[PDB]
Design a protein around this ligand. Structure first.
Ligand code: CCH
Length: 291
């Protein structure tokens, strides 16, 4: 399996910037979502979910194919709640029908992060919609009631090392868990719609109590009213993870750089970019454009 990136016929950066801007404008507009959190977080999760199905062993899954659009993947239990992100993007697609699905899903994640004050994430176009037949089976996404060993092992399937894993996990500063969706309830911090290193700070500074939730699952609860998943928690239980956690808790800049690189990589896994492919684009935020 080889997935070669093929630029949408006759489209350029400017063409992408527009899709970006549309998404960005809509985020700005549809702010009531999830008790005023906004769709930022959900879009970041969508991009990660369409990308986390990848399997470095046989190259199946990953963002390339836009397979999320198919029932199999769409109805994946680990995907519960992602439909709100889809529905959000649907009109955008209608407006820009020439964009491939994988390109759209992934671009919304990039837009989200940058509009939420995150770092700039270089992005590449070229994903090609694939047939229903290429939809990976359910079960490729990670479970939350596990530990560091599970996490290390899991992430390896996507080629991510310790550092990448910790960086990537800081995405948990955003949004929250929802009982009805995953069997977990509560946010991980206070500024849930702004990109910061809050995650690490929380993990290291709160007084966490393990408790069972209404779904009968364990989670670490803080007095402040925050929560952490077992998998999140495991980042402080593991010696190697822990020092990275500390480094990020100490330097947001470092965090941002590392996050940026890992996120791109995560979104570009399983894809082959020809020599003549354009460089990755760095989009301007609304604010940078005075819009
Ligand atoms: C870089 C992206 C990223 C990584 C990587 C990543 C990795 C992990 N995630 Fe996550 N995720 C976000 C981004 C990332 N997460 C974001 C953002 C959300 C918030 C969504 C929302 O607020 O609707 C978000 C929500 C949840 C939910 C809540 C679902 C609900 O709505 O009820 C669960 C459970 C959960 C489980 C795990 C586990 C397990 C892992 C890996 O081990 N994540």
């Amino acid at each position: 399996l080889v997935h070669v990136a093929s630029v949408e016929k006759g489209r350029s950066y400017e063409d992408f910037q527009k899709v970006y801007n549309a998404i960005a404008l809509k985020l700005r507009e549809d702010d009531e979502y999830d008790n005023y959190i906004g769709y930022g977080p959900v879009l970041v999760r969508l991009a990660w979910h369409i990308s986390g199905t990848w399997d470095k062993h046989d190259n199946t899954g990953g963002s390339y194919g836009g397979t999320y659009r198919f029932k199999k993947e769409f109805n994946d239990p680990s995907n519960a709640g992602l439909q709100n992100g889809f529905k959000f993007l649907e009109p955008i697609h209608k407006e820009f029908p020439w964009i491939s699905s994988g390109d759209l899903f992934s671009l919304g994640g990039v837009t989200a992060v940058q509009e939420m004050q995150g770092p700039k994430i270089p992005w590449r176009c070229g994903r090609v919609d694939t047939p229903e037949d290429t939809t990976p089976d359910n079960g490729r996404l990670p479970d939350a009631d596990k530990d560091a060993g599970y996490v290390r092992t899991f992430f390896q399937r996507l080629n991510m090392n310790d550092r990448e894993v910790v960086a990537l996990m800081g995405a948990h500063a955003l949004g929250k868990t929802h009982l009805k969706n995953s069997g977990y309830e509560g946010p991980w911090g206070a500024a849930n719609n702004v990109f910061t290193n809050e995650f690490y700070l929380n993990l290291l500074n709160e007084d966490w109590k393990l408790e069972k939730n209404d779904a009968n699952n364990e989670q670490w609860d803080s007095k402040s009213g925050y929560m952490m998943l077992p998998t999140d928690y495991s980042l402080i239980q593991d010696p190697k993870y822990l020092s990275i956690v500390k480094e990020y808790a100490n330097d947001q800049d470092k965090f941002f750089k590392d996050f940026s690189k890992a996120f791109e990589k995560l979104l570009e896994d399983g894809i082959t970019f020809p020599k003549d492919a354009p460089s990755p684009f760095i989009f301007k935020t609304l604010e940078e454009q005075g819009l």
